[PDB]
Design a binder for this molecule. Structure first.
Ligand SMILES: CCCCCCCCCCC(CCCCCCCCCC)(CO[C@H]1O[C@@H](CO)[C@H](O[C@@H]2O[C@@H](CO)[C@H](O)[C@@H](O)[C@@H]2O)[C@@H](O)[C@@H]1O)CO[C@H]1O[C@@H](CO)[C@H](O[C@@H]2O[C@@H](CO)[C@H](O)[C@@H](O)[C@@H]2O)[C@@H](O)[C@H]1O
Ligand SMILES: CCCCCCCCCCCCCCCCCC(=O)OC[C@H](COP(=O)([O-])OCC[N+](C)(C)C)OC(=O)CCCCCCCCCCCCCCCCC
Ligand SMILES: CCCCCCCCCCCCCCCCCC(=O)OC[C@H](COP(=O)(O)OCCN)OC(=O)CCCCCCCCCCCCCCCCC
Ligand SMILES: CCCCCCCCCCCCCCCCCC(=O)OC[C@H](COP(=O)(O)OCCN)OC(=O)CCCCCCCCCCCCCCCCC
Ligand SMILES: CCCCCCCCCCCCCCCCCC(=O)OC[C@H](COP(=O)(O)OCCN)OC(=O)CCCCCCCCCCCCCCCCC
Ligand SMILES: CCCCCCCCCCCCCCCCCC(=O)OC[C@H](COP(=O)(O)OCCN)OC(=O)CCCCCCCCCCCCCCCCC
Ligand SMILES: CCCCCCCCCCCCCCCCCC(=O)OC[C@H](COP(=O)(O)OCCN)OC(=O)CCCCCCCCCCCCCCCCC
Ligand SMILES: *P(=O)(O)OCC(C)(C)[C@H](O)C(=O)NCCC(=O)NCCSC(=O)CCCCCCCCCCCCC
Lengths: 85, 37, 98, 38, 74, 494, 77, 60, 340, 73, 170, 80
């Protein structure tokens, strides 16, 4: 009844496609890294979590905002927090 | 459920229609034109 | 050290601009201006300058701090936080006589 | 500001026939306005 | 959906039942029972308060005045 | 034979029975508790019968027995309006105190039960004797059974607690004894009827006031003389802690109705500003400290110091409302205080082994019934209406205010401050989180025994708070005899 | 005609309205009783009572046209 | 002054809708047909439109 | 508390001192409250602050020794204030229990009944003419000036700013929740008309729907009252010579009665002034949000405007001084006694 | 006596309670402390008692009409 | 009618609060809301009774505190202020009771919630129907206890705990 | 969803999501108890409600049908 695997992926997929700075919308997958796979950098990736938090209405602590560096970790980190709506 | 829209409009329509109606009769009195008597 | 803290203050900066300017149109211009400031001083190398530079912007975050920042309802400090907390120990009491 | 410019009263204190003497509690209670100083 | 009511009153699990400790008979039949029996008996205890005695006299004292029209004109 | 001697001898039969069954029949320790419990309930039955024959508007002492056997010291028993409700409260509390400690006393059960039965006879003799030397003989006779009860069944600091209560009580009493002796020399006796129609010199009254007031100030207790209570109420077993806070504290309140108001009228009137200074200082100081107390038992114990100051000021009001509310307050306090000690020293302590409020939090999640009664009990300690505590608080505060406005005003800050610590303690134990994380082992809620002794105590404080006329009715005529004053047009009528 | 106190204490009109015009207050308070105070029922005679309120008010505002000048336009309150 | 190149006036000067941002494609949904300046105030006074016609009919 | 003074009116009528403190306690409270409610970021906080401004309006009226108006306003406020709290309550329920204005907007198409009833409740609170709240609160303002005294005219001014800032918070609640651009996430707004989903079309939409029967029925019932109830009952409480409280329930002394002068002595402009100040200050609040809307941001970062934003958001700093000078001092006094 | 439930006894919390319990042994007569003891034991009761002395019998409300006074002294 | 307006909300709260195990959720709502709707009906009638007819009514049940000069009664006087004050209180309480069936339909402790607002209802009637200041104070103290118990309804939240101490102590 | 909770905790207000299987049967029983003593309260009130004014015969006043202090007045006035 809670957040599902298919729900989070399709929601996040439509989000990072909102950049004009990624390599291409077709270069994002479940295991896509924010730096090696798709085109971001040190300062862009932290804006992604500060948009992910907004569009899941949660709070990302600074200690846990650094391990998150790939789409797959974003998918699983959401599922670990039951407060996500 | 379109029933919610009808009650919203009805209350707004009933409200506003009241102000014009309550201004057609009581309006001149509080503007200093016509005393009630 | 000197890298994580810089990124943390970036989020705090964008968070505080939205907290003060509610309108998402207008914070977007503000947020774009902030990213320029972080990009401008990207190549600073000397650790003595890096620590001083980080210290200064912490005062800026303090000098324009919001009287009350936004906090999602389930977040610590949110409206719904700790509302219907379940019991920690679901197991029945052990057999004791009192 | 209000103290410097606030309007004077418009109407004289209402006159009361007999000052509401009996029905405000008699001479042992406060009475109403009746032919007093203004 | 709703759940059926649950819990162990007095801590007695559904398999077992409550076991008397030795204070129950004296407390319920003695202390509480005496307090109830005392209550009904109190309803028949004659009134001995100073007010109901003084209300009677004060009633006569005000009767011999303009207050409290007395039943008999003497 | 008088019913008043029946009150005194029944608990001695229980002592005889408990100590002798072993010879009559390895008797199970459960039988002694049933004997001790049945003994206390038979005593309540006689007290209920005495109260139903009692006359609420008689000035002569009732249920007296002819002696005609005059010795140097003789025991004369009588009961009037003021003393009867103190008698009923001892008889109502003693069965509950035994049932409260039913499972907690594990060793020396004869010793524990025999001391409690002895204490019931000794405590009841205090409110029943008709002599001021008899009064002192029984006021100080409880010291040995209380000393042994604390050291035999007390907690870790029991030796210090048992030394503090005996020495403070012994010292304050020796000052009361010197005053009682001076009166006997002047009048030739301390029998109530003879001594009550004595009018001492004012200077004598002043030195008689002091010493008597020195004693009662230590046993009230007033702030600055209250170190013994915090040591002895906390370290005492739950049953003895109930008797110490519900009955023992109320001997000095009743002692003002026999030793200060009817025979020291001028001194009481003149020295009221000293008493009201101590009382108002006590209310403030006893309230701020119990905000900071971290022992839950010490916190309930030391709120009694704050309520004892209120009815001590109401007993010096010289006002029929203050004097009656003082008795109502001391009567209601012995209900709520008994229940709170059960809640803290009996229910929390027996489950956790610790009295520190740090370890408790959110017990409502696990113990719905405990939070129910512990909340009504905290509302009573805060003087909320529909509770006899409110009526005693309200009436003795009006008398205090009407006697000395500024002292009554300062005393009237207990509406704020008593609620300040009763709800602060409630919201830290019952509320204020989910469940304390130091509880690695889930608890059980109130047992049937825990439920009944609490339900009985909140019942008395609520029925008597909705209809305080049950106590106030028999109290009106006799307290009329302890007021000092006249009216300019209602005195010396011819 | 003015309403004397004898039929005006019996009418149970409020103290602050015990004045000359209250003769029209007694009938006004009867419509309110009889018509459940509805503000569309005796507007006719309510206007009459409100009219006499105005005239007595006007006689009480013209009385300072000599009083205010007597004080030279000072603060009479 | 302000070794970090932050000036409040230029912060304030950059308070608008930017000509280009890396984020319109995700943020543009807010300023759309459902949430246009016109459709958002299309029903700010819900029943006002109908009442005006009804009131005119009563007057005539 | 308002009922206590109304009930005690036979006693307090015989001391003008307590009526003067009544008249100034309420005047200070009604403006102390409106100035705070404008800067609150929680919706329920704004409605709570509005409750205390109208409660000050009740206390101020009692100071005017007009207990009939206070009863009329205490009754009329009850009906529309509940509708505001209950209508807001459906807003918090529609979103994921969010209570911050910074996350609402555009919800008018999503909460059509909720917006309509909260708009009706808002006009009665601002005393838009011919509405339930209009007949009650606006008459206190006329009575305040109708009492031709320094204090009465003073607190007419004191309360006319309170009227202005009430309009401003009223707009803020109504605009930021429904009429503004979406400030919350997709979840509040993502309707099912657009697909946006491949295999999870059954769930994940939840676009802030309206309530059910039990949730909306009180809102419709409370709406009727806020449109008509004040007009129907205005003769019972206000009247000009009504005899409703002739059991000495509400006692007014002839000496300081101001009813006749309020209806006759007040100039026409002052009687109609709050209506002028409400329309003028409501369009400006609409003009300074989605029409100009920079000036607020300029002000919130102006050094002077920054401090007064935080002065009023932090509730006149009263709670800050209450804790460190009253409750902490009481807590430290206890520490001295226990330890020393 | 009877065993209780298992409690996660915090060593820091149990040593705070022991310190608070044992605190009385370490008190000393120092410069600040005598001021605190003098203030709350002497000065404050003396002030409260003195004002009670100077207001005793001063006021009475019992049946005071208009024309009488609250004061009697 | 004039003692049934007082007592009826008290019965709903007692059953909903002490036998909510037996009545369940929807039964507790049915009892508490019906006791308030019916009490609302009577207080509307009592408005026409007292106000529109100028007939106040007095009920003295028994005496609360008897001590020499002071005779405080459990007694109730309905007047024009009482019936007027009972209209908003009972009408809004009825609607909020109905509002809560769908609003708190997710919260687990739903019998305790409905028992508290039906207990607040009782106290607010006690306050305004009293003969004297002291019986009024029973409703005044009781409204504070009901407001405390409802501000700290979610008692596992520390914020609700601090806001309830503030409400009860201020 | 639904908050997990201990099944060993007994509450008088029910517990967490407590609805008995017999909720309707017991609600009926309690509703009769509430009605039964409310009528007793009604009976006591009608006998001790005291008035000093008598309602007009033509006026809506449902109190007239049970309260004794004016019920006897109507029949007493029906004697001329
Ligand atoms: C750590 C300080 C301890 C201070 C102790 C002071 C003890 C003083 C004597 C104690 C006492 C009562 C004892 C009651 C028990 C409590 C005793 C006190 C407990 C602690 C507070 C003895 O009482 C006996 O006194 C006899 C006379 O001696 C009389 O016979 C009776 O009054 C009585 O038998 C007081 O009686 C008093 O009677 C008065 C005349 O009525 C005597 O004269 C007074 O003083 C004169 C100047 O001295 C002055 O002219 C004048 O003011 C007055 O005439 C007193 O001198 C004193 O005797
Ligand atoms: C009296 C009539 C109304 C009684 C309501 C009884 C509510 C029962 C209840 O709360 O259940 C235990 C409830 C639990 O109910 P529950 O159903 O939530 O239990 C399951 C959930 N757990 C176990 C997590 C709690 O316990 C508490 O919430 C704590 C007790 C505090 C409140 C106790 C009752 C307060 C009302 C008593 C009267 C107060 C008014 C005094 C006014 C003074 C006037 C001057
Ligand atoms: C009234 C209830 C009386 C009562 O229950 O007394 C209890 C006790 C014996 O009862 P009990 O403990 O249940 O015996 C079980 C034996 N298998 O009864 C006793 O043991 C009382 C013994 C009294 C001995 C002295 C009797 C003469 C006085
Ligand atoms: C009143 C008259 C004084 C009565 C004091 C007790 C007399 C009764 C008695 O003698 O009790 C005997 C009891 C010894 O019992 P015992 O055989 O040792 O079995 C228990 C082993 N733990 O020994 C005891 O238990 C007596 C302990 C109680 C002491 C009472 C306190 C006296 C205070 C002075
Ligand atoms: C549930 C029902 C409770 C309401 C019952 C009271 C009622 O409706 O009024 C009765 C009234 C009959 O009285 P009657 O003498 O016939 O008046 C009309 C004469 N042509 O019926 C009438 O026709 C009179 C007009 C209705 C009564 C006035 C209604 C508005 C008064 C304020 C109501 C406030 C409600 C809150
Ligand atoms: C007027 C005035 O001068 O207000 C000054 C004050 C802000 O003081 P400011 O110098 O800007 O502090 C800068 C700190 N970085 O501004 C304030 O904070 C005043 C707060 C109280 C405002 C009272 C209502 C406004 C009064 C002026 C209109
Ligand atoms: C809850 C309210 C309880 C109401 C039930 C009792 C009211 C019945 C009215 C009555 O006639 O009995 C009242 C009774 C004594 O009434 P009283 O004022 O003393 O009249 C005799 C004066 N000589 O007084 C009593 O019944 C005592 C009330 C008991 C309160 C606790 C139980 C509830
Ligand atoms: P990516 O870009 O993440 O790489 C980051 C690197 C590793 C380059 C570091 O940033 C780095 O080493 N940079 C050089 C040395 C350093 O540590 N610099 C840190 C950044 S300094 C900076 O950004 C200064 C401006 C800070 C923001 C000022 C304004 C703050 C907000 C005010 C808000 C007022 C109310 C709205």
């Amino acid at each position: 009844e809670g957040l599902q695997k298919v729900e989070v992926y399709e929601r996040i997929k439509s989000l990072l496609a909102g950049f004009d700075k990624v390599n291409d919308p077709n270069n994002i997958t479940e295991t896509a890294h924010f730096a090696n796979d798709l085109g971001l950098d040190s300062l862009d990736t932290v804006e992604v979590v500060m948009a992910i938090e907004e569009e899941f209405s949660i709070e990302i602590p600074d200690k846990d905002a650094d391990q998150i560096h790939s789409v797959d970790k974003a998918i699983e980190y959401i599922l670990r927090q039951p407060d996500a709506h | 459920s379109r029933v919610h829209r009808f009650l919203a409009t009805g209350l707004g329509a009933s409200m506003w229609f009241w102000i014009f109606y309550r201004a057609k009769k009581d309006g001149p009195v509080l503007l200093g034109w016509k005393h009630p008597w | 050290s000197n890298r994580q803290a810089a990124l943390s203050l970036y989020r705090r900066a964008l968070k505080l601009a939205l907290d003060w300017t509610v309108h998402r149109n207008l914070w977007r211009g503000q947020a774009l201006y902030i990213r320029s400031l972080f990009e401008k001083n990207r190549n600073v190398t000397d650790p003595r300058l890096q620590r001083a530079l980080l210290k200064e912007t912490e005062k800026l975050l303090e000098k324009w701090k919001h009287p009350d920042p936004y906090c999602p309802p389930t977040a610590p400090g949110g409206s719904k936080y700790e509302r219907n907390l379940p019991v920690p120990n679901l197991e029945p009491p052990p057999p004791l006589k009192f | 500001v209000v103290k410097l410019t606030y309007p004077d009263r418009v109407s004289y204190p209402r006159e009361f026939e007999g000052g509401l003497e009996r029905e405000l509690g008699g001479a042992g209670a406060v009475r109403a306005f009746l032919c007093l100083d203004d | 959906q709703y759940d059926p009511p649950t819990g162990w009153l007095w801590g007695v699990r559904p398999g077992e039942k409550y076991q008397n400790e030795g204070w129950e008979g004296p407390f319920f039949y003695g202390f509480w029972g005496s307090l109830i029996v005392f209550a009904i008996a109190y309803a028949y205890k004659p009134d001995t308060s100073i007010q109901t005695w003084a209300l009677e006299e004060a009633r006569r004292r005000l009767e011999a005045e303009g207050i409290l029209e007395d039943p008999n004109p003497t | 034979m008088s019913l008043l001697y029946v009150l005194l001898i029944i608990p001695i039969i229980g002592i005889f029975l408990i100590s002798t069954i072993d010879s009559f029949y390895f008797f199970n320790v459960s039988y002694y508790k049933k004997i001790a419990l049945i003994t206390t309930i038979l005593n309540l039955i006689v007290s209920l019968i005495i109260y139903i024959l009692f006359d609420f508007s008689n000035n002569q002492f009732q249920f007296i027995q002819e002696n005609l056997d005059l010795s140097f010291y003789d025991i004369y028993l009588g009961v009037d309006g003021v003393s009867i409700y103190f008698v009923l409260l001892t008889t109502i509390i003693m069965p509950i105190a035994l049932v409260s400690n039913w499972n907690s006393i594990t060793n020396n059960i004869k010793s524990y039960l025999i001391i409690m039965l002895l204490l019931e006879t000794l405590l009841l003799a205090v409110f029943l004797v008709l002599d001021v030397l008899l009064f002192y003989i029984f006021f100080e006779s409880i010291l040995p059974p209380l000393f042994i009860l604390i050291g035999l069944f007390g907690s870790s600091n029991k030796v210090r607690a048992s030394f503090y209560i005996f020495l403070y009580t012994l010292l304050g009493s020796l000052f009361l004894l010197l005053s009682i002796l001076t009166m006997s020399s002047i009048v030739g006796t301390t029998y109530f009827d003879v001594l009550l129609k004595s009018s001492f010199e004012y200077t004598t009254q002043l030195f008689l006031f002091f010493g008597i007031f020195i004693a009662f100030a230590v046993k009230t207790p007033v702030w600055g003389l209250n170190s013994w209570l915090l040591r002895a109420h906390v370290e005492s077993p739950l049953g003895g802690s109930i008797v110490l806070a519900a009955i023992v504290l109320k001997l000095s309140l009743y002692g003002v109705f026999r030793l200060i108001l009817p025979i020291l009228p001028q001194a009481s009137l003149n020295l009221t500003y000293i008493v009201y200074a101590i009382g108002a200082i006590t209310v403030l100081y006893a309230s701020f400290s119990t905000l900071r107390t971290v022992d839950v038992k010490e916190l309930i114990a030391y709120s009694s110091v704050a309520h004892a100051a209120i009815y001590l000021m109401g007993v010096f009001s010289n006002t029929i409302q203050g004097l009656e509310g003082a008795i109502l307050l001391g009567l209601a306090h012995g209900f709520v205080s008994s229940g709170l000690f059960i809640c803290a020293g009996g229910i929390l302590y027996d489950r956790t082994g610790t009295r520190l409020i740090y370890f408790f939090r959110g017990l409502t999640q696990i113990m719905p019934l405990f939070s129910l009664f512990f909340f009504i009990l905290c509302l009573g300690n805060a003087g909320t209406p529909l509770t006899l505590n409110f009526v005693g608080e309200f009436m003795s505060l009006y008398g205090t205010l009407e006697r000395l406005p500024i002292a009554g005003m300062l005393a009237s800050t207990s509406i704020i401050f008593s609620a300040a610590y009763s709800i602060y303690m409630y919201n830290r134990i019952a509320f204020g989180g989910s469940v304390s994380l130091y509880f690695i082992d889930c608890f059980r809620d109130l047992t049937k025994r825990e439920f009944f002794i609490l339900f009985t105590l909140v019942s008395f404080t609520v029925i008597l708070g909705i209809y305080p006329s049950f106590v106030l009715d028999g109290l009106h005529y006799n307290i009329s005899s302890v007021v000092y004053g006249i009216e300019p047009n209602a005195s010396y009528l011819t | 005609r003015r309403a004397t106190r004898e039929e005006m204490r019996d009418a149970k009109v409020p103290l602050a309205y015990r004045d000359s015009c209250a003769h029209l207050l007694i009938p006004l308070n009867r419509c309110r009783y009889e018509t459940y105070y509805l503000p569309w029922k005796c507007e006719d005679e309510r206007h009459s009572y409100e009219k006499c309120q105005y005239l007595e008010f006007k006689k009480r505002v013209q009385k300072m046209e000599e009083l205010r000048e007597a004080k030279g336009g000072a603060r009479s309150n | 002054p302000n070794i970090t190149g932050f000036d409040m006036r230029e912060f304030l000067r950059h308070t608008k809708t930017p000509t280009y941002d890396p984020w319109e494609r995700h943020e543009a949904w807010r300023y759309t047909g459902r949430f246009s300046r016109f459709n958002r105030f299309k029903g700010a006074l819900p029943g006002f439109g109908i009442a005006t016609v009804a009131f005119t009919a009563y007057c005539v | 508390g308002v009922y206590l003074l109304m009930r005690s009116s036979p006693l307090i009528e015989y001391s003008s001192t307590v009526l003067l403190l009544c008249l100034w306690l309420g005047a200070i409270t009604t403006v102390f409250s409106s100035l705070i409610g404008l800067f609150q970021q929680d919706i329920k906080k704004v409605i709570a602050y509005s409750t205390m401004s109208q409660l000050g309006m009740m206390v101020l009226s009692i100071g005017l020794s007009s207990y009939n108006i206070a009863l009329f306003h205490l009754v009329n406020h009850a009906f529309y204030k509940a509708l505001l709290f209950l209508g807001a309550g459906s807003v918090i329920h529609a979103v994921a229990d969010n209570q911050d204005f910074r996350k609402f907007g555009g919800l008018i198409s999503y909460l059509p009944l909720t917006y309509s009833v909260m708009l009706i409740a808002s006009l009665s609170l601002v005393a838009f003419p011919f509405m339930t709240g209009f007949y009650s609160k606006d008459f206190i303002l006329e009575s305040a000036y109708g009492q031709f005294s320094f204090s009465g005219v003073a607190v007419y001014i004191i309360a006319t700013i309170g009227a202005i800032f009430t309009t401003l918070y009223s707009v803020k609640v109504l605009y930021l929740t429904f009429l503004s651009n979406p400030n919350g996430p997709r979840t509040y707004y993502r309707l099912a008309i657009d697909n946006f989903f491949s295999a999870q079309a059954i769930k994940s939409y939840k676009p802030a729907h309206e309530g059910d029967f039990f949730l909306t029925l009180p809102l419709v019932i409370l709406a009727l009252f806020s449109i008509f109830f004040g007009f129907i009952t205005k003769d019972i409480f206000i009247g000009l010579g009504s005899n409703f409280f002739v059991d000495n329930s509400l006692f007014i002394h002839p000496i300081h009665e101001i009813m006749i002068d309020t209806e006759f002595a007040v100039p026409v402009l002052f009687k109609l002034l709050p209506f002028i100040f409400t329309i003028s200050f409501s369009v400006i609040a609409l003009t300074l949000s989605e029409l100009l809307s920079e000036l607020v941001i300029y002000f919130k970062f102006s050094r002077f405007g920054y401090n007064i934003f935080g002065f009023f958001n932090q509730r006149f700093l009263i709670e800050f001084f209450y804790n460190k000078y009253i409750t902490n001092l009481i807590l430290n006094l206890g520490g001295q006694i226990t330890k020393i | 006596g009877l065993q209780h439930y298992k409690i996660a006894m915090d060593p820091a919390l149990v040593r705070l309670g022991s310190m608070i319990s044992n605190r009385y042994k370490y008190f000393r007569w120092t410069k600040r402390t005598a001021l605190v003891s003098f203030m709350y034991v002497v000065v404050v009761p003396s002030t409260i008692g003195y004002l009670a002395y100077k207001t005793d019998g001063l006021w009475d409300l019992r049946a005071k009409r208009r024309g009488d006074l609250i004061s009697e002294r | 009618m004039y003692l049934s307006i007082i007592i009826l909300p008290l019965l709903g709260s007692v059953v909903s609060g002490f036998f909510g195990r037996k009545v369940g959720v929807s039964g507790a709502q049915l009892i508490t809301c019906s006791s308030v709707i019916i009490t609302t009906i009577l207080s509307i009638i009592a408005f026409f009774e007292v106000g529109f007819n100028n007939i106040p009514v007095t009920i003295n049940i028994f005496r609360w505190i008897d001590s020499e000069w002071f005779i405080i009664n459990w007694g109730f006087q309905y007047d024009s202020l009482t019936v007027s004050m009972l209209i908003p209180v009972l009408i809004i309480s009825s609607l909020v009771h109905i509002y809560s069936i769908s609003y708190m339909s997710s919260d687990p402790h739903n019998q305790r919630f409905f028992s508290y607002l039906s207990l607040f209802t009782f106290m607010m009637i006690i306050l305004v129907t009293a003969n004297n200041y002291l019986l009024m104070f029973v409703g005044w103290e009781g409204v504070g206890v009901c407001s405390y118990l409802l501000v700290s309804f979610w008692f596992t939240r520390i914020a609700a705990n601090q806001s309830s101490i503030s409400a009860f102590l201020t | 969803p639904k908050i997990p909770y201990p099944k060993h905790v007994w509450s008088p207000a029910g517990g967490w999501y407590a609805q008995p299987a017999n909720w309707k049967q017991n609600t009926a029983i309690f509703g009769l108890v509430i009605f039964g003593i409310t009528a007793m309260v009604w009976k006591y009130s009608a006998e001790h409600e005291v008035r000093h004014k008598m309602p007009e015969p033509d006026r809506f006043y449902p109190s007239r049908y049970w309260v004794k202090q004016i019920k006897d007045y109507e029949r007493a006035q029906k004697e001329k």
